[PDB]
Design a protein around this ligand. Structure first.
Ligand SMILES: *[C@@H](CC(=O)OCC)[C@H](C[C@@H]1CCNC1=O)NC(=O)[C@@H](CC(=O)[C@@H](NC(=O)c1cc(C)on1)C(C)C)Cc1ccc(F)cc1
Ligand SMILES: *[C@@H](CC(=O)OCC)[C@H](C[C@@H]1CCNC1=O)NC(=O)[C@@H](CC(=O)[C@@H](NC(=O)c1cc(C)on1)C(C)C)Cc1ccc(F)cc1
Lengths: 305, 305
C-alpha cells in the first residue's frame, strides 16, 4: 500500500551524462551514440544572454572549442550542428552505455522524471509534469542546463525534455530533444510571461482513484453528474475541461475501483465547492494534479523496467 | 530555484538488484561482492507467515533451493547464513558493478531514497524518512521485499534499510542490512502496534528555511522565543522537542538566510497556534517534516555525486 511521488529509475540516464565546456561556460549534455546533445547557449556567456546571436557564435567556433568530458575521459568533437535551440555535437567515440532510447514531444498534462545534474554529474531525480501553460515546476540552479526529463518502457528511455531556462516567476522552460521550445519561450534574457496555468482535471481524478485504492474514501458522495455540469463548475475554479478522451483514459481506474467516472466527478464537484475542511487525502491538504492515470496504475499495480 | 521531493540517483543501486527464488516465493536481493542479501522470509510461504520458524526452514534447505537470477544469468549459491532477519547468500561470482558501499543504521528523523523493485527489476525511486516511531510511509506491494533504501556521498552508497513488512495501518517496517529491525517489529503476521508518531520538528524548520530561500516569506514574523517556551507549545501539537543539537544543525541554514533559529522558531510557533489560513508554503498546505537540514542544503546548493 501507499502512494508517493515516484520517479523512474535513473541508472540508464546516468550513464549518458557528460559535461560540455565551450570557453568558460560549462553545462551538461546527453551522450547518445556518436552525438552529444546540449543547449545552444553553451557558446555564449551571460554577457550575451540579453539577446544572443547564436549563429554568429557557432560560425566563429571550431570543434576544438567544444570540450566534452565523461568523468575523466575527454571526447573529440568532429562536427557541430544547430537543431533549433539544441546543439548536436558529433564526437569520434560512441557511448557504450547508450540505452534503447527515443525522442518524444510530450503533451500538456503528461508527467516525466527529471535527473538534475551539474558539471555532468547527477545530483538527484524527481517527478514533474508539463503544465497546461508549457512550464514545469522544477528544482534547478545555475549549471543545471543539459539536465533532461524522460519516461521509460521496460528498456526504451523516452527523452522528452532538456532544461534551458528559469522564468523570474520561479517556473521553468525548456525544449524537446529536437530543440523546439515547449510554449512560446526562446532562450534569451527577455521578459516572457507564461499563460495562466490551470489545474489538470484528469490527473486530479486519477489521484482520487489512487486515494480510494489506498483507503482514503471519506470524500465519496452519493451523487452523479453530467459531463457538462461538472465542466461548468470546474470552469469556475480554473480546472481544465474534461473531455470524453479523459473519461476513457480513466476507464481502467474506474473498472478497478468500481466507481464510475461521472460519480467520481460528482465527488470532486463537492470538494471544489465546499473544500476539504482541514481533512487530508493521501496525506495532502490540497488536490494533487501531477499524477497521470498511468502513473497511478504503474504504482498501484507495480509495472517494472 | 524550486524545491521538490528529490531522491538520490539510483543507477548504482540498480546494478546490484537481483531476484531470489526459494521454492515458489520470489523476492528481491542486494548483490554486493560475493554475497546476496535478502529477507529471511524467502524460505517460508504465506502459510507460515502466522508464526514462522525460520531456523527449521533454513536447516532443512540447501544452496540449490536458492535460485538467484540477475536478468538472465543465474547464480550458484555456495553457502547461506542467517544474520538476524536477513539472509546472507554467498555465491560463486562477485557482482562486477558492486559500488563503493557501506551499511549504516540511520536514526529517527533521517531521510533516505528507496528503489522499489519487483522480480529483481526496479519500478521507481522515491524519498522517505524514518519516523520517530521507526516506521516509514512507503509505497510497496506484494513482491517488494528486498527493496532497499540508501544515501549517497559522491560514490559511497550507504545502504540503511531493507523492506520486510507492511502494518495493517498502511505504514511499513524493515531492517538495516544487518538484519536488525527498526523499532519493535518482527517478521511474522502478528498484530504489532507502532508507537504514536510525532512531527520531526527540526525538519519542519529546515523546510521553512528552504521556503525562505525560494521566496515564500509571508510566515516570517517579528518575534523571537526561548528554546523552552517553543518546546512548551510544540509539545501540545505532537512535535518532537528541539534540542540544542538540532539548533546547531540549522546553523548553516540560519547563517545562509540571516534568520536566527529561535526567530524561525517564533515563526513556527505562530503557524502551529493559528494555522496557515488557506495559504501555502512551497506549494504545500501542510507543514512538511520529511526534509533534513542536509536535504535542503544539497538541493538549494547543488551537491553532486
Ligand atoms: C541554465 C544555464 C546553465 O547551466 O549555466 C548557468 C548560466 C540556467 C537555468 C537557470 C539558472 C538559474 N536557475 C535556473 O533554473 N539558464 C540560464 O541561466 C538562462 C538565463 C535564465 O534562465 C534567466 N531567465 C531568463 O532568461 C528568462 C527567460 C524568459 C522567457 O523569461 N526570463 C534566469 C537565470 C533569471 C541563460 C542560459 C545559459 C546557458 C544554457 F545552456 C541555457 C540558457
Ligand atoms: C513483502 C514480501 C514479498 O515480497 O512477497 C510477497 C509475500 C511484503 C510487503 C507487503 C506486502 C503487501 N505490501 C507490502 O508492503 N511483506 C509480507 O507480505 C509479510 C507479511 C505482511 O507484511 C503483512 N503484515 C504483517 O505481517 C504485520 C506485521 C506487523 C508488525 O503487523 N502486521 C501484510 C501483508 C498484511 C510477510 C513477508 C513475506 C516475504 C518477505 F521477504 C518478508 C515478509
Amino acid at each position: 500500500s501507499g502512494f508517493r511521488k515516484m520517479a523512474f529509475p535513473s541508472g540508464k540516464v546516468e550513464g549518458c551524462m557528460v559535461q560540455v565546456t565551450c570557453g568558460t561556460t560549462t553545462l551538461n549534455g546527453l551522450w547518445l551514440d556518436d552525438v552529444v546533445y546540449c543547449p545552444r547557449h553553451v557558446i555564449c556567456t551571460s554577457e550575451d544572454m540579453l539577446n544572443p546571436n547564436y549563429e554568429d557564435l557557432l560560425i566563429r567556433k571550431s570543434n576544438h572549442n567544444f570540450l566534452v568530458q565523461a568523468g575523466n575521459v575527454q571526447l573529440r568533437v568532429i562536427g557541430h550542428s544547430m537543431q533549433n535551440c539544441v546543439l548536436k555535437l558529433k564526437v569520434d567515440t560512441a557511448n557504450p552505455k547508450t540505452p534503447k532510447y527515443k525522442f518524444v514531444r510530450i503533451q500538456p498534462g503528461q508527467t516525466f522524471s527529471v535527473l538534475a545534474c551539474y558539471n555532468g554529474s547527477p545530483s538527484g531525480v524527481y517527478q514533474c509534469a508539463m503544465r497546461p501553460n508549457f512550464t514545469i515546476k522544477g528544482s534547478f540552479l545555475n549549471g543545471s542546463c543539459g539536465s533532461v526529463g524522460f519516461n521509460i518502457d521496460y528498456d526504451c528511455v523516452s527523452f522528452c525534455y532538456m532544461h534551458h531556462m528559469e522564468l523570474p516567476t520561479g517556473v521553468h522552460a525548456g525544449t524537446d530533444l529536437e530543440g523546439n521550445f515547449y510554449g512560446p519561450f526562446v532562450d534569451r534574457q527577455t521578459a516572457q510571461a507564461a499563460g495562466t496555468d490551470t489545474t489538470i482535471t484528469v490527473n486530479v481524478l486519477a489521484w482520487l482513484y489512487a486515494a480510494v485504492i489506498n483507503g482514503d474514501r471519506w470524500f465519496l458522495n452519493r451523487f452523479t453528474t453530467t459531463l457538462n455540469d461538472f465542466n461548468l463548475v470546474a470552469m469556475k475554479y480554473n480546472y481544465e475541461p474534461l473531455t470524453q478522451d479523459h473519461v476513457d483514459i480513466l476507464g481502467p481506474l474506474s473498472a478497478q475501483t468500481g466507481i464510475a467516472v461521472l460519480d467520481m466527478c460528482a465527488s470532486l464537484k463537492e470538494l471544489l465547492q465546499n473544500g476539504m475542511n482541514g481533512r487530508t487525502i493521501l496525506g495532502s491538504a490540497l488536490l494533487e494534479d501531477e499524477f497521470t492515470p498511468f502513473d497511478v496504475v504503474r504504482q498501484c499495480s507495480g509495472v517494472t523496467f
